[PDB]
Write an enzyme that holds these catalytic residues in place. Structure first.
Site, PDB file in Angstrom:
ATOM      1  N   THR G   1      -4.879   1.920  -1.886  1.00 33.91           N
ATOM      2  CA  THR G   1      -4.912   2.291  -0.440  1.00 33.91           C
ATOM      3  C   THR G   1      -5.069   1.097   0.454  1.00 33.91           C
ATOM      4  OG1 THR G   1      -7.303   2.707  -0.542  1.00 33.91           O
ATOM      5  CG2 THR G   1      -5.936   4.490  -1.107  1.00 33.91           C
ATOM      6  N   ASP G  17      -0.409   3.305   3.774  1.00 37.46           N
ATOM      7  CA  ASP G  17       0.576   3.413   2.715  1.00 37.46           C
ATOM      8  C   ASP G  17       0.363   4.725   1.977  1.00 37.46           C
ATOM      9  OD1 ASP G  17      -1.838   2.719   1.458  1.00 37.46           O
ATOM     10  OD2 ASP G  17      -0.941   1.194   0.178  1.00 37.46           O
ATOM     11  N   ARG G  19       0.371   6.140  -1.471  1.00 40.57           N
ATOM     12  CA  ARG G  19       0.305   6.177  -2.927  1.00 40.57           C
ATOM     13  C   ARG G  19      -1.142   6.355  -3.348  1.00 40.57           C
ATOM     14  NH1 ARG G  19       2.595   1.350  -6.574  1.00 40.57           N
ATOM     15  NH2 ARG G  19       0.554   0.399  -6.152  1.00 40.57           N
ATOM     16  N   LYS G  33      -2.232  10.082   4.290  1.00 41.43           N
ATOM     17  CA  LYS G  33      -3.565   9.518   4.363  1.00 41.43           C
ATOM     18  C   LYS G  33      -4.028   9.531   5.816  1.00 41.43           C
ATOM     19  CE  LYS G  33      -4.106   6.271   0.684  1.00 41.43           C
ATOM     20  NZ  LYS G  33      -4.578   4.861   0.590  1.00 41.43           N
ATOM     21  N   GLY G  47     -11.007   5.126  -0.366  1.00 38.05           N
ATOM     22  CA  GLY G  47     -12.099   5.348  -1.289  1.00 38.05           C
ATOM     23  C   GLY G  47     -11.789   6.473  -2.248  1.00 38.05           C
ATOM     24  N   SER G 169      -0.920  -0.668  -3.729  1.00 38.91           N
ATOM     25  CA  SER G 169       0.233  -0.621  -2.844  1.00 38.91           C
ATOM     26  C   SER G 169       0.671   0.820  -2.619  1.00 38.91           C
ATOM     27  CB  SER G 169       1.374  -1.441  -3.426  1.00 38.91           C
ATOM     28  OG  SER G 169       2.516  -1.362  -2.601  1.00 38.91           O
TER      29      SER G 169
END
Lengths: 230, 234, 233, 232, 204, 204, 221, 104
Positions: G1, G17, G19, G33, G47, G169
């Site tokens: 993250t 990002d 993933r 996110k 986290g 990433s």
């Protein structure tokens, strides 16, 4: 502290004495109409204050439950505000566990569930507010009414408050199953116009619709607009 | 204060319970919905509130409530209380599954609900649940069976008993206890309701099966217009 | 049975405790009239010392909720300070729980709601004091509110509270349909035209808030004395 | 029968369990308290029943926080109860906030305690009027008086008890503001001997510049000096 | 909004009471080039000013009145706009053949937004339109169309007035198949409403 | 570890209006296979299968617990469950027992009950919704069932191709593992059928 | 993250990002996110992937209950203080290093919430591991009082600088632009990472299976 | 309410005439008549005090209008303009009732 004995009890006739008194306190309340329509509802009500002295943008009677569900009352003043508080909380329990806006039917299940234990459970008197519910919930709109007993029924039109027999008979006369948008608002306005005790002021009525994009109150420039189009 | 309490949990000097038999008179004001079992499955036969147009659609009615795949219940008396308790007893049904992985043979359920409803008339000082609701169901142990309970607490297997006003004595001159052939049970149901009628002002619902799993049908509209013309005389 | 004993429904509605609690706020009667200015919500009330043995500074109604909200109440003064302490409690609890300082409306909603749960449950009396309370937020103008002992806050321009409520709101209704930052012909003159004393600057308590200075200020005999000698038009 | 419960109003808004507690201190003896610029002087009437009771058989000048006082009027059980929870209240203030308790906050606190105790049918109201009094080095001679209703006012010369109808007149005619407390200790006996119209074995305590924020039964010499205000 | 969507916005504020001739067809430059209440009150007070001078409210009213025009103009503003504008078409006109189709476009137009009550509003004012211009033949027929809906609805809400008007159409030519029956029938349905002295005294 | 106690491996993948959920019929201790039949694909709706992996007492515990709360939900409001809502419900079943959690990662495979738009979801231990339109993977042997079935899955597949690819992904995935495998099971969920089948695997 | 957010003259620009990698393998290649709380407040999340979800469903639900209790639009200070006080009393067991930003009646501003409950009013924030990969590109080319388009380009360059040299990433950048009048929650902004392509078809038809027992069950009728 | 239940019985009365304590469409006519027999200076309004329709006889219309004129006798005026109308009405324009908020 507390009582832990029910003050609502059975008559020797075999009926609840407090609940019929609650329907009396509802029937002495301000008149309010609600019209289920083919795409969306309209829930009009009558805000007559004592004088022309108060802020008519301060308190509301149309007010949503957090997504697309408004609810309008007739009867006791602040017991309604408690039922809005409990109803918003129950809709947010449902929203945090199931991640969708609550179906209207389930909100009426839980609001009728919380109004039941005040017909029992320790010294509390029942609320005496028979508020009615709206909601778009997927595909076709809903409409309900939670009596201070705890019952609920769905329909196409109703009234409540003062002289509601004239509202139920008059809406039984003028209703069509396809009657859908602002024509419902029209007949709602001429259901409150039936008595109103006089002159049909736009600051003394407020309506709320559920036009497939969330429940929303109507601005006071829109009710007076159709009061110009009477 | 002790001046204010209604004192619900007191025996009469005649020995009975004042707040309990006041619930029994609450049933006679509003109440219908007989139930007939056969060698085949069991049906409720019910009445709605009045003629008042102003009623759009009930998914199930305010009368017949689904409880499991193989049980259902109907309700008399005060409709505000029983809704609560039927959700309450619905919880009971599911947790029996959680405890046993069985579909809860219905006498367990009726016994549990009658124990908690007896507990509300035993202590706590509250008013009793003013509803003499009844139950239909099936288990693998016994056959098709219906039970019937009241706000006092007792219950029973009540093969053709109705609840509410105008009290079932004609049924205990007409029901054939051996074989019943559920189509003729529909005919007897519309006989009794024809004496006490399309689906604007009736609510009849059957429980049947196919290949082991039970089917609870609510008898959609046009079937009632079939059976209402299945008379001439009665 | 116990319709006039317990907060329960009588026949025809009309639970007989809140109007028995409304008659409790007229006991004695030290009477507030609140004036609202498109930029200044002034506060007026009358206050009578009995015998020149009370400390006149200690007797007041005029409490301060926070740095932006003042209040004045005309009920029985036993039930007053139990109500204003909970309002201070919910103001500071709002500022600790939700960040910003509480705006004036839902404070009165909240004390109206605990007054509701007084008049919903039994075994407690609905305490007889109504809270004329003013205050300014960033968005709108100055506001004023009054929750009754039943919990029905309204959102007012200019009501009053105490004995002689009807004469006061009749005078204000007759003197607001004409159209006032100075409030010299409105604030005191409601009292001097209702009950006709034409006060010296002792017995009147005035609490202003202004848009230019939102801190709640209780005035003294100097500035209220200039305010009273300004009634020479 | 709109009586007998504090949670039930009258039909004109008057909770009768409070005004029945108010006459329940009007059938008990006087206890006057006089403010002046160096502190507050208390004086309590005593109505000594038999010779069997000794001196100070029942304390009616309690103290609470090493500076505020407790001239009480009504039922001594109830007054003694709220005296000791006032002790616990100033205990929680001094333990909690460190700073020695200002008297206005203590009178508002005990005031809302005895008021919030009159909202329930599960309790009776208290039957004891009482008054406080002290001064910090920058407070002024603060005293307050609290009814069984729970209302607390700042006074100068308040007087509670049976003969407060007499007692308020002499305290009003006494020069109130600018005398230095020693004379008014002496002058307190003149009020007590006037209002006693029938052993009157009185008792005095104060807080002052001779005390520096404390309490003493008198020390003991004005009891043979203010006794010499007989024949007035 | 383009660059010339709000260029002459103040012109429908000063010229509302400047002069009765300085905005004859001048506000039409606003009408066929904020803007929703200025445009709606431009049609309302331009149409009222031309319904004060006398004629150009339905002439330039026709120049603004073709209606591939409105869907989302705060729909009750379309109710009040079409209602009062057609009221100015009805209340006074200049060329007699015009207003027949000016209100007919409002009937088939009122079919489009599905406003049921606005239909019988302009059908009452439309049978009243056909009686004033001496049509005498199918104001009869649309009067027979109007009573079918009124009968379904609350009895004689306005068909006391429409029934009065078709009762005025016969006595121009006709006989007893109306004379007592429909007029007295209108009176039987005329003692069950809040009657103003206009309708009740016109029925007198 | 503790996730490697009973093994277990479920997955789900969709093409066209069918989905495909698949488990491995195996249960036992780290080295021992005490049985072969073991229910991991629990039916909840008609066309909505939940599949669970990891510690076996948690998969039966929240399988039966989820049948409790799910069954009571569709009893309280009569309809088949919308599968996004069931994803939210297992999201608030694995969570709120966060401290000392359940040791399972349930995948949820199926169809919208009225539009038949398929989707598949996966959750972690404490419950996080991974909505996915490609394929989800749960169990001990995760990245094989990734990895390979990311190397096989093409979009928009009819049930016989999806049939074949989840067959190959399961067989060659769990063959390359010790504590999983020994006969697998594949449920195809069409818009009219449930093609339930077993697969003879490398049972060793 | 890798996450980030920059305040500018009209408003704020968040960004993350997409993933989520449990262990050392990506479980899901496209997850939001940037979580809703409010029509004027979006938060973010780093986290623990579930704890951010549950803490922003709870503060989202409780906050919009609060806002429809007040009637006005909810301020962003009360979201900061409810996340602070509710996230503090669990002693940091919730690992939710989330930032949150909002345009409201005072001014557009953003806060950062560390998982123990420490809040920071900042012009620009970065949580996650990719903080380190996306803080330096707020230290060479960040300017106060900057216009929206190069702020969007700034945050896309920051998250894009968290893509290329961090092992937390993401696939692609999504970023929200919260202004005074309009909200622009746009999912993916740029996709700098294509899938590639396959070479050669694989399967037969009705083969390549070891079927042991079929079973067919109809559904409708 | 207590007349006798044998005083009618179709022979002794055969009729019954209710007198209405009038409302909106009548109250206007009462004000039009009683003001039509006075001196008015048109600063008055008619339908403003036909509005607030609240529990009046015709006798108290004669009281508020008669009282309006007599309150105009203070300044020895031969007409009535603004306050004596409104003034007398409010003074004894029903000297109020007793509402009762919440319910309503």
């Amino acid at each position: 502290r507390g009582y832990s004995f029910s003050l609502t009890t059975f008559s020797p006739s075999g009926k609840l004495v407090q609940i019929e008194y609650a329907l009396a306190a509802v029937a002495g309340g301000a008149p309010s109409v609600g019209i289920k329509a083919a795409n969306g509802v309209v829930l009009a009500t009558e805000k007559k204050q004592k004088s022309i002295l108060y802020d008519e943008r301060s308190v509301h009677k149309v007010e949503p439950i957090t997504k697309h569900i408004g609810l309008v009352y007739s009867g006791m003043g602040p017991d309604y505000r408690v039922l809005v508080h409990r109803a918003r909380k129950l809709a947010q329990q449902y929203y945090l566990v199931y991640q969708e806006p609550i179906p209207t039917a389930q909100l009426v299940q839980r609001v009728a569930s919380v109004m039941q234990e005040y017909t029992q459970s320790g010294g509390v008197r029942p609320f005496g507010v028979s508020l009615l519910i709206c909601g778009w919930n997927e595909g076709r709109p809903y409409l309900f009414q939670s009596d201070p007993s705890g019952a609920y029924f769905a329909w196409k039109a109703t009234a409540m408050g003062k002289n509601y027999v004239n509202g139920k008979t008059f809406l039984e006369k003028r209703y069509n199953e396809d009657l859908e948008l602002e024509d419902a608002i029209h007949t709602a306005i001429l259901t409150l116009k039936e008595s109103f005790e006089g002159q049909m002021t736009e600051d003394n009525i407020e309506v709320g619709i559920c036009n497939e994009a969330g429940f929303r109150r109507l601005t006071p420039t829109e009710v007076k607009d159709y009061l110009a189009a009477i | 204060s002790r001046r204010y309490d209604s004192r619900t949990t007191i025996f009469s000097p005649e020995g009975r319970l004042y707040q309990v038999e006041y619930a029994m008179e609450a049933i006679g004001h509003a109440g219908t919905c007989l139930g007939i079992l056969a060698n085949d499955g069991v049906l409720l036969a019910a009445e709605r509130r009045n003629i008042h147009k102003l009623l759009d659609e009930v998914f199930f009615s305010e009368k017949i409530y689904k409880l499991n795949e193989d049980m259902a219940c109907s309700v008399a008396g005060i409709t505000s209380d029983a809704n609560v308790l039927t959700n309450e007893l619905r919880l009971i049904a599911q947790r029996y599954l959680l405890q046993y992985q069985e579909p809860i043979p219905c006498e367990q359920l009726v016994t549990a609900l009658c124990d908690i409803k007896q507990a509300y008339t035993q202590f706590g000082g509250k008013r009793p649940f003013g509803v003499s609701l009844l139950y239909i169901g099936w288990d693998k142990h016994y056959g098709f069976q219906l039970y019937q309970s009241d706000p006092s607490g007792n219950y029973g297997g009540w093969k053709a008993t109705c609840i509410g006003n105008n009290s079932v004595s004609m049924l205990k001159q007409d029901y054939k206890e051996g074989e019943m052939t559920l189509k003729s049970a529909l005919a007897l149901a519309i006989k009794v309701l024809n004496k006490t009628l399309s689906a604007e002002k009736v609510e009849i619902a059957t429980l049947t099966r196919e290949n082991g799993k039970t089917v609870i049908r609510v008898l959609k509209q046009k079937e009632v217009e079939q059976l209402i013309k299945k008379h001439e005389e009665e | 049975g116990f319709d006039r004993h317990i907060t329960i429904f009588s026949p025809e509605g009309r639970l007989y405790q809140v109007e028995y609690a409304f008659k409790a706020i007229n006991q004695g009667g030290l009477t507030s009239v609140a004036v609202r200015g498109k930029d200044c919500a002034v506060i007026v009330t009358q206050k009578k010392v009995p015998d020149k043995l009370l400390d006149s500074s200690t007797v007041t109604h005029l409490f301060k909720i926070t740095e932006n909200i003042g209040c004045v109440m005309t009920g029985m003064t036993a039930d007053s300070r139990s109500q204003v302490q909970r309002a201070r409690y919910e103001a500071a609890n709002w500022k600790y729980k939700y960040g910003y300082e509480i705006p004036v409306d839902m404070l009165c909603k909240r004390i109206a709601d605990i007054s509701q749960v007084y008049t919903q449950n039994a075994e407690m009396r609905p305490l007889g004091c109504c809270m004329i309370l003013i205050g300014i937020d960033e968005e709108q103008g100055p506001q004023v509110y009054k929750c009754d002992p039943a919990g029905y806050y309204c959102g007012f321009k200019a009501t009053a509270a105490g004995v002689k409520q009807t004469e006061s709101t009749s005078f204000l209704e007759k003197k607001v349909k004409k159209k006032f930052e100075q409030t010299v012909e409105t604030a005191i003159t409601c009292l001097s035209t209702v009950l006709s004393i034409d006060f010296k600057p002792s017995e009147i308590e005035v609490g202003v808030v202004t848009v230019e200075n939102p801190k709640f200020r209780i005035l003294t005999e100097a500035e209220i004395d200039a305010h009273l000698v300004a009634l020479a038009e | 029968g709109y009586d007998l419960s504090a949670s039930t109003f009258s039909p004109d808004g008057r909770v009768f369990q409070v005004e029945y507690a108010m006459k329940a201190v009007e059938n008990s003896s006087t206890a006057i308290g006089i403010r002046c610029k160096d502190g507050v002087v208390f004086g309590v009437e005593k109505l000594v029943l038999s010779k069997l009771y000794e001196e100070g058989s029942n304390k009616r000048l309690f103290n609470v926080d090493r500076h505020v006082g407790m001239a009480v009027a009504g039922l001594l059980a109830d007054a003694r109860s709220l005296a000791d929870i006032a002790r616990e209240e100033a205990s929680n203030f001094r333990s909690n906030f460190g700073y020695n308790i200002p008297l206005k906050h203590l009178a508002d606190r005990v005031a809302m305690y005895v008021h919030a105790y009159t909202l329930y049918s599960a309790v009776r109201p208290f039957g004891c009027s009482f008054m406080l009094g002290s001064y910090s080095v920058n407070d002024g001679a603060q005293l307050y008086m609290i009814d069984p209703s729970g209302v607390s006012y700042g006074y100068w010369g308040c007087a509670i008890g049976k003969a407060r109808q007499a007692a308020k007149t002499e305290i009003e005619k006494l020069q109130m503001k600018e005398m230095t407390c020693r004379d008014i200790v002496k002058e307190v006996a003149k009020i007590i001997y006037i209002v006693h119209d029938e052993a009157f074995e009185l008792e005095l305590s104060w807080v002052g510049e001779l005390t520096n924020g404390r309490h003493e039964i008198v020390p003991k010499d004005i009891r043979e000096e203010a006794e010499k205000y007989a024949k007035e | 909004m383009a660059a010339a969507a709000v260029v002459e916005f103040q012109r429908a504020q000063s010229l509302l009471s400047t002069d009765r001739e300085a905005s004859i067809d001048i506000l039409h430059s606003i009408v066929k080039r904020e803007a929703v209440q200025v445009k709606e009150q431009s049609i309302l007070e331009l149409g009222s000013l031309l319904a004060k001078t006398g004629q150009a409210a339905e002439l330039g009213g026709l120049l603004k009145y073709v209606r591939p025009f409105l869907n989302s103009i705060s729909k009750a503003k379309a109710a009040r706009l079409v209602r009062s504008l057609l009221d100015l078409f009805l209340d006074m006109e200049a060329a007699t053949g015009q207003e027949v189709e000016l209100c007919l476009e409002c009937i088939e137009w009122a079919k489009s937004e599905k406003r049921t009550f606005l239909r019988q509003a302009l059908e009452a004012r439309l049978v009243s339109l056909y009686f004033d211009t001496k049509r005498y033949q199918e104001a009869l027929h649309l009067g027979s169309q109007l009573l079918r809906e009124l009968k379904k609805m609350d009895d004689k809400a306005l068909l006391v007035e429409v029934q009065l008007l078709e009762s005025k159409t016969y006595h121009a030519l006709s006989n007893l198949p109306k004379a007592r029956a429909a007029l007295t029938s209108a009176r039987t349905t005329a003692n069950a409403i809040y009657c103003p002295p206009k309708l009740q005294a016109t029925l007198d | 570890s503790i996730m490697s106690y009973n093994g277990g491996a479920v997955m789900a993948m969709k093409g066209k209006n069918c989905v495909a959920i698949a488990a491995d019929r195996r249960f036992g201790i780290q080295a021992q296979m005490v049985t072969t039949d073991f229910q991991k694909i629990f039916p909840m709706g008609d066309r909505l299968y939940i599949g669970l992996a990891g510690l076996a007492t948690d998969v039966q515990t929240v399988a039966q617990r989820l049948k409790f709360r799910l069954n009571l939900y569709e009893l309280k409001e009569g309809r088949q469950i919308k599968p996004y809502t069931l994803m939210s419900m297992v999201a608030n079943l694995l969570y709120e027992k966060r401290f000392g959690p359940y040791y399972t990662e349930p995948v949820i495979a199926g169809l919208d009950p009225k539009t038949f738009k398929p989707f598949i979801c996966s959750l972690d231990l404490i419950g996080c919704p991974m909505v996915t339109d490609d394929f989800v993977v749960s169990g001990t042997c995760a990245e094989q069932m990734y990895g390979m079935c990311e190397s096989l899955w093409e979009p928009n597949m009819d049930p016989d191709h999806l049939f074949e690819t989840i067959s190959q992904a399961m067989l060659n995935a769990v063959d390359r593992d010790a504590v999983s495998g020994m006969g697998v099971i594949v449920h195809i969920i069409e818009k009219d059928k449930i093609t339930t089948r077993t697969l003879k695997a490398r049972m060793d | 993250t890798t996450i980030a957010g920059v305040v500018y003259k009209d408003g704020i620009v968040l960004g993350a990002d997409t993933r989520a990698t449990e262990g050392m393998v990506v479980a899901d290649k496209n997850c939001s996110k940037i979580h809703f709380i409010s029509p004027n407040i979006y938060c973010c999340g780093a986290g623990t992937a579930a704890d951010t979800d549950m803490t922003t469903q709870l503060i989202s639900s409780n906050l919009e209950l609060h806002s429809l209790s007040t009637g006005r639009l909810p301020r962003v200070v009360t979201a900061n203080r409810m996340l602070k006080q509710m996230l503090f009393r669990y002693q940091g067991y919730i690992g939710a290093a989330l930032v949150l930003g909002g345009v409201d009646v005072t001014g557009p501003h953003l806060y950062s919430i560390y998982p123990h409950g420490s809040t920071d009013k900042l012009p620009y924030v970065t949580m996650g591991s990719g903080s380190l990969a996306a803080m330096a590109v707020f230290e060479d080319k960040f300017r106060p009082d900057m216009e929206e388009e190069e702020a969007k380009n700034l945050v896309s360059e920051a998250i894009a600088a968290g893509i290329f040299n961090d092992l937390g990433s993401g696939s692609n950048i999504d970023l929200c632009v919260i202004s005074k009048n309009k909200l622009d929650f746009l999912r993916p902004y740029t996709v700098p990472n294509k899938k590639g392509t396959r070479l050669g078809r694989y399967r037969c038809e009705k083969g390549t299976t070891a079927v042991l027992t079929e079973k067919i069950t109809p559904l409708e009728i | 309410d207590t007349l006798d239940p044998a005083l009618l019985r179709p022979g002794r009365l055969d009729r019954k005439i209710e007198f209405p304590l009038p409302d909106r469409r009548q109250k206007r006519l009462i004000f039009s008549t009683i003001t039509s027999k006075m001196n008015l200076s048109e600063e008055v309004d008619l339908e403003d005090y036909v509005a607030r329709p609240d529990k009046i006889s015709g006798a108290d219309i004669n009281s508020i209008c008669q009282e309006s004129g007599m309150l105009a006798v203070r300044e020895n005026r031969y007409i009535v303009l603004a306050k004596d109308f409104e003034k007398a009405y409010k003074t004894v324009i029903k000297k109020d009732e007793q509402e009762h908020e919440f319910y309503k």
